[PDB]
């Protein structure tokens, strides 16, 4: 008569490492590094990413005629990039602190565009176009967002100047741009005056410009340039403008609501997916239960940390050694 | 029929730990399921703890910098760096401990079931061998059946001091 | 005959978690997490707080004459400023590098006010005042570190200019200030010329403004603007300024002693204490001797680390199981 | 009266680990004063070092941002964050395992007491029951004072020996 | 001559553990080559894990800031303290465990040897004493060198049992 | 007869700290923290360090006449700066952006200087001189990347233009400047012009200047003062440059391979050494073997995790306990 105590081995073929011995077979494991990914760009807690394909942000912000994008009202979680995207800054020159205006437009929990100024009220000629920012249907064109002012017809430029009250429900991004044209001839015919003062100011931003003439190298058929510029009226406060030429105006603002987090990717191939997630890294949509996970080091949403590792198998059975 | 010294057993299905016993009415394996539930919620515990007390809050994003912005751009780059640094090497180390101290466990919870029977036993049976106890008694399916459940005395004290002077 | 081994059990309740259980009984713990703090701002090793109730740090440096703030010799450890604190820049404008400015101020292991320039030696009218710029008494009156220069009467501003050495010890914060009057009549009523250059240099610095007429946003009475400027004149150099018109000049100077660690705390409700400690949180102060604390992640001194946690109870006795 | 096996004893009270012995004089509980320093040295090292490597040098001050300066203010948060959710899974996961090893540790020193007088005890008892040995000589209040201490060797060797074939 | 019980042996030279053997023909030392080679292998793996795991991948340069700069001047030095207190307190601690466990594992190593002779021994010796069996038979010495090889039976099984009752 | 198991003691007097106890003796050790270190600065995988003794990164760039250095084709894998060295920008004045203009001077996996303008073919007079930077011969000169132009005799100074195309296998580090002249005698005798506008352009960058007359306080004999400036020409890109004066014109610029790492070593004592390291601290190279290191916090190339801590040993063998 005869009494044992024993164990369970079973059929598993799993092994795990331990501090003291490689592939040590065991009953059962479990996984802690995710490596399964849904390789596709998904909605997340904050909604629907905004896909740009043939637009870089500065040219849908400042509304290059050839970007057709449909900014929706909703607003957008993200900002997907395509780095093949050729259309920017159409007339060319660039634009002061880029990166924080793309970091601005990256996220929003809503979107309004505003009109700020109507420039048939102004003593001017309005709404130039130009060669270098041709629309999609085919003629020439100009940015959505900013007004090219020439001197009234037949040779008149003033101090023009105008405000803005900004009454609504957030804080607005406004756009401008001076420009330099190549030579005084071009200054001349264009703006009357040899030389300009433009200001752009609110209760807190104070900033003039003057031109500066002379020939650039040729950039898309122009050797002018444009600076371009931005700038952020809080609720309540007022935007006053005044120009005696060179000021690309400002026509239409912008009203993000919600916090920006610098969500841009920028990435070529990866598509848009019909899908939800509550991760969304950089190379796809992934589950969130494991504590680590190895799709990319960037990501948004609620993601485990990312280790650079195949796998990380976690004993949970008994070493698996039959008798 | 060996114990647990001589390897695992792969009829036992309903358990980590168990008995086999030999009689004259034949043999019976099953697991003892009290020392078996106790295991599965220590390790249960286990994985909620390393699996739970991350912190799924904080995103990453990949952050755009002029060509004078060099600096703050290395800067960035070092954090996530050595942040990573840190993970890598800690989830790595966690888990090869964890998991020795693991399989140390399941053979600890083994020689405890054991040794609780020998105590119950007590001069009823020779320990010796191989995880297995030679009872020096009369003892069938009805006494084998206390001796997992633990209610068993030393009824039987002095039919095995016969037995065991032979 | 019998000898028995055993262990104590005792009457704790408390308990602790492991890796393997919950809730444990143990006979002894100990705590590692510090949750008790006193909710005050106290001394620290380098001294003691500076409280601003009324004024921005921007409106004591400049010297807004509403702030009668006493900043002393001894120095202070780090700054407390409310959020309420109505007074800021009294003329409207703002300060470049404002956040580097209030960063330096922040702390002082000891202070001492310079006298840079006296304007009486200057062909100038000065010490002008605004409406803007009420003192606490009810006047009209101007900052107490910045100077507003006006042409001398009946009408000349010429170019003016002065030096003044660094002959203390150590490092000088000095302040200066550019008019931008709303029309061209202000402008040649305050300063004759219809342009002016003013020149604020050092050994090392290389700065010059011309002003930008035009009218801005009403602000506190206002039209006209003001853009401020700050500098370090470093021991042993030397500071030269150069105007005719539209600079408010440097008068009065900072010599703070220590280097500054940016220790401002934004904070309403928590008062300052008659107290010290190594270890002040931003939201009071704690003991030290424990490895963790959960009051706060923001702190100054000698601190534990911050985990936001209730609790990390460490076993020290035995298991409580009683026979 | 029973040992370890049966659960702690609320009458000792001048020590964590001890003795408890019943002879025709009446019984005697008290501390083993040797492995109880032991083991409170021990665990004033463990609370030293997990208490005392904390660095306390580095302070964490608010910075204050410009509303053109979003990135560097994200990125120094993202240091803030990451760091803390080191600190918070680390420090957890230290406690809740050194825990478990504390426990463990306080286990293993009582069974090192039991098995440090089954040696010294010899064929003299029997290791049967609860974390107790009956002794099967006379040993009068001197001699478990000496099984206590260490100074205890097998003179009673023949006197066991006829009681044990009783 | 004693076992592991009382001490080490300045004796073996040849390994961490093994056998002190006296019959009549004299005495014998040696190493265990197995249970030595066994354990060699561990310590291999985990000194092997705990310095290959490291990434020696990223850089630390002493970066430059403007006097204007003052603020990403701190973040810069925030990041590199923060992460310099992260490794100094995960690394004293991370030895510090380790090397308790790594004594602790030889004292398991040794026991688990000496119960593997105790299993093979069986009624055969008296395990009584000092990590040491007194063999009841006459044990010569190709006896001793199949207690240790692991190639021995109960042969004997009444040239004790006579011996036994003696 | 008996058998007997046991353990091995030796003569080691190591010991080890374990968690429970201090100073234990063990049979065998190894040490975790490397804290030998040969004091010197090796090549590295990336190459040979470039020391500069006499001179500043600044003045080998722009090309301080005082400054003899070998700047060679192979490159450099990090520059060591002696603190010492005296030689900095000659002519008195700032470089704007001066930390990220080290920066990109650090490392280069290869060097070539190329001719950006040749001033022969240009109407002004070329390649004035100062006795604040005099050659290490002896007399008065100028930097060698950039060229001080005068107007051409006897008084004329017409608008100048000039353009460069970098057809070169990279970028193009370029450099120019501005003179500030003390006074408007100095400034109509130098240029003729009194204001002039100086204009740096490429096919992204659009900037200009005008001269602010003035006396600064006397530096290196001189109270005018030069602004100092770069700019990176990419690839393709056509670099345009236009003054009717005051403009110190780019001459030479840098077309560096690799990316820079910030290798910059502010170092006085240690020498350069005759050796080779995967890993190069601040304070000498070390072996990387070891997981941790004490010798620096700063370092390049494959390193062990810096630590302060004299040791770190590991436990190897028993704890060496003889009977
Ligand atoms: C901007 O658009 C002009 C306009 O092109 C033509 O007019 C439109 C109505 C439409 O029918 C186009 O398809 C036509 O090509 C472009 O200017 C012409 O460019 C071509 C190609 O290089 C050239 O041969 C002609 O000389 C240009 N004609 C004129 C009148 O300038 C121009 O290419 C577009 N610019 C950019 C940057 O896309
Ligand atoms: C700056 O102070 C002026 C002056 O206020 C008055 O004069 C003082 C001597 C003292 O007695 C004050 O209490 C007086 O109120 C303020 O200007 C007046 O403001 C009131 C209230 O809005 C208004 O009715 C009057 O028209 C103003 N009078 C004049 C002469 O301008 C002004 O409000 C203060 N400015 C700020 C920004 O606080
Ligand atoms: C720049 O060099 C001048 C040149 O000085 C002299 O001329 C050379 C050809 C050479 O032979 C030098 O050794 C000569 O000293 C320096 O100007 C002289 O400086 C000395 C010392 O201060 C002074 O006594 C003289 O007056 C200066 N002579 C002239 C003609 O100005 C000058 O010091 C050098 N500048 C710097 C910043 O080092
Ligand atoms: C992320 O983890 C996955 C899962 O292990 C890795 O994908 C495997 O990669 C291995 C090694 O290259 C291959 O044998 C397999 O083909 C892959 N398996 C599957 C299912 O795709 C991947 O390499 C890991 N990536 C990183 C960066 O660690
Ligand atoms: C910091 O720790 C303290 C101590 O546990 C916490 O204060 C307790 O909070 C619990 C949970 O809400 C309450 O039951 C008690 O009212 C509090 N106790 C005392 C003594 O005040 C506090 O919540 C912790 N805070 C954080 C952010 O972790
Ligand atoms: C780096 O590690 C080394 C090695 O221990 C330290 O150098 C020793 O320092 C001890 C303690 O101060 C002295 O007893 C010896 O003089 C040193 N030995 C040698 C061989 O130099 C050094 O102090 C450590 N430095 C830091 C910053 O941790
Ligand atoms: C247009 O001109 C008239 C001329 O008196 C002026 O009153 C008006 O303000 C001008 N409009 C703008 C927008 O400046
Ligand atoms: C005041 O004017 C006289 C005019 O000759 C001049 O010498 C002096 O330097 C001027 N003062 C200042 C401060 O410029
Ligand atoms: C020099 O002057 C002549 C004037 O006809 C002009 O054509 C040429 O471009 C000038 N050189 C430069 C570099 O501007």
Redesign the interface.
């Given at each position: 008569?005869?009494?044992?105590?024993?164990?369970?081995?079973?059929?598993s073929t799993d092994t795990?490492?331990?501090?003291?011995?490689?592939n040590?077979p065991?009953?059962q494991t479990?996984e802690?590094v995710e490596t399964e990914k849904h390789p596709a760009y998904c909605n997340t807690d904050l909604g629907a990413p905004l896909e740009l394909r043939d637009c870089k942000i500065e040219a849908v912000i400042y509304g290059n005629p050839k970007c057709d994008i449909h900014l929706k009202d909703q607003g957008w979680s993200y900002i997907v990039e395509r780095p093949s995207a050729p259309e920017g800054m159409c007339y060319?020159?660039?634009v002061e602190?880029?990166?924080?205006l793309?970091?601005?437009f990256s996220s929003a929990a809503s979107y309004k565009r505003i009109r700020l100024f109507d420039y048939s009220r102004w003593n001017v000629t309005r709404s130039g176009t130009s060669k270098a920012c041709n629309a999609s249907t085919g003629g020439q064109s100009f940015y959505r967002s900013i007004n090219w002012l020439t001197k009234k017809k037949p040779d008149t430029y003033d101090f023009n100047?105008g405000?803005y009250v900004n009454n609504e429900d957030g804080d607005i991004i406004f756009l401008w741009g001076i420009h330099?044209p190549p030579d005084t001839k071009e200054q001349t015919t264009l703006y009357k005056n040899a030389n300009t003062?433009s200001?752009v100011?609110?209760?807190?931003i104070?900033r003039?410009f003057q031109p500066?003439?002379?020939?650039?190298?040729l950039?898309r058929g122009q050797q002018g340039?444009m600076?371009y510029y931005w700038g952020?009226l809080k609720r309540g406060?007022?935007?006053?403008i005044?120009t005696n030429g060179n000021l690309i105006a400002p026509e239409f603002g912008y009203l993000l609501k919600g916090e920006?987090?610098?969500?841009?990717?920028?990435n070529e191939d990866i598509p848009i997916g019909n899908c939800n997630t509550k991760?969304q890294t950089?190379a796809g949509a992934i589950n969130?239960?494991?504590?680590?996970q190895n799709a990319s080091?960037?990501?948004?949403?609620?993601?485990?940390?990312?280790?650079?590792?195949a796998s990380?198998?976690?004993?949970?059975?008994?070493?698996?050694?039959?008798? | 029929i060996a114990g647990f010294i001589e390897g695992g057993w792969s009829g036992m299905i309903d358990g980590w730990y168990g008995f086999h016993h030999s009689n004259s009415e034949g043999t019976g394996m099953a697991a003892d399921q009290k020392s078996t539930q106790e295991a599965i919620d220590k390790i249960t515990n286990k994985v909620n703890n390393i699996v739970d007390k991350m912190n799924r809050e904080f995103e990453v994003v990949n952050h755009e910098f002029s060509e004078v912005e060099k600096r703050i751009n290395m800067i960035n780059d070092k954090i996530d760096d050595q942040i990573e640094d840190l993970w890598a090497y800690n989830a790595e180390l966690l888990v090869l401990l964890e998991n020795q101290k693991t399989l140390d466990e399941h053979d600890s919870n083994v020689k405890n079931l054991f040794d609780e029977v020998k105590r119950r036993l007590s001069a009823n049976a020779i320990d010796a061998g191989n995880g297995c106890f030679d009872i020096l008694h009369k003892c069938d399916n009805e006494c084998m059946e206390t001796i997992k459940n633990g209610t068993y005395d030393h009824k039987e004290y002095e039919e095995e001091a016969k037995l065991e002077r032979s």
């Open positions: 008569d005869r009494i044992c105590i024993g164990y369970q081995s079973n059929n795990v490492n331990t501090l003291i011995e490689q040590v065991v009953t479990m802690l060319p020159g660039s602190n880029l990166e924080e793309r970091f601005v100047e405000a330099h003062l200001s100011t609110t209760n807190t104070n003039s500066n003439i002379g020939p650039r190298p950039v340039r600076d952020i406060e007022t935007l006053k005044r920006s987090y610098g969500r841009i990717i920028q991760c950089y969130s239960s494991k504590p680590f080091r960037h990501y948004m949403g609620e993601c485990p940390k990312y280790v650079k590792k990380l198998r976690l004993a949970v059975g008994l070493r698996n050694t039959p008798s | -």
